[PDB]
């Protein structure tokens, strides 16, 4: 379900050219484009079957699929928080569908590994898996994301381990790392590549003299 704020003429709005979810065929599931918001009291919509908001136009499309629905079954969902950073901790939608739909665009745009609040998701397919690990765990990128002090660094297992290793450097409190998956789904290879990062950086008793 969704919050009542989006199913309200006052609090939430429809501007022409915004995306919307049609509350029908429930188990949602329908996306549409707004054309007009006060067609004879109701909301006219264009059910669909790289666009800036900022120019407002309907999507030009032959054979339109217009339908009338009131503003009790439409929710504005798009823009064309919600996990704006690669850390999708924010998550403006309470449902897990925001995690899945953000991961839809992250699957299409090939960045894949994604810090998820406390969690992280990697959804890499069986196709040439060693190429995916070798880009994100090469000795180049190994010392790279040590060198940056988080901020601009991509949300990676390098940051996931560096959180626990910064509470090593200052907090001196107990930490925990763990990887999940399914039947031989390279989660062991994620953990071992993450594990090399633990004792690469920081001088971990560089070989001293006889005095100490």
């Amino acid at each position: 379900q969704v919050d009542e704020s989006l199913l309200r003429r006052s609090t939430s709005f429809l501007r022409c050219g915004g995306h919307v979810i049609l509350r029908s065929h429930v188990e949602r599931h329908r996306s549409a484009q707004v054309i007009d918001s006060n067609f004879l009291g109701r909301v006219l919509i264009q059910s669909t079957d790289f666009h800036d908001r900022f120019a407002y136009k309907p999507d030009p499309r032959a054979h339109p699929n217009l339908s009338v629905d009131a503003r009790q079954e439409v929710v504005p969902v798009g823009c064309l928080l919600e996990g704006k950073l690669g850390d999708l901790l924010y998550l403006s939608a309470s449902t897990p569908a925001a995690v899945v739909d953000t991961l839809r665009g992250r699957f299409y745009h090939d960045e894949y590994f994604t810090k998820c609040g406390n969690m992280l998701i990697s959804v890499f397919p069986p196709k040439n898996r060693e190429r995916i690990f070798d880009t994100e765990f090469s000795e180049e990128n190994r010392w790279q994301y040590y060198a940056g002090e988080i901020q601009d660094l991509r949300p990676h297992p390098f940051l996931l381990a560096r959180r626990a290793l910064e509470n090593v450097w200052l907090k001196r409190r107990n930490q925990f790392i763990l990887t999940f998956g399914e039947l031989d789904a390279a989660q062991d290879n994620i953990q071992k590549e993450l594990f090399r990062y633990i004792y690469t950086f920081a001088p971990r008793d560089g070989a001293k003299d006889q005095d100490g």
Partner: peptide, 29 residues
């Protein structure tokens, strides 16, 4: 597994502050 429980039993006034990761596939496995 109980030795993994025993290192949890060793010190740790707070629980070990965790960081987790899942490794799954894009399609259905």
């Amino acid at each position: 597994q109980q030795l993994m429980n025993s290192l949890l039993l060793s010190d740790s006034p707070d629980p070990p502050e965790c960081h987790f990761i899942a490794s799954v596939n894009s399609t259905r496995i």
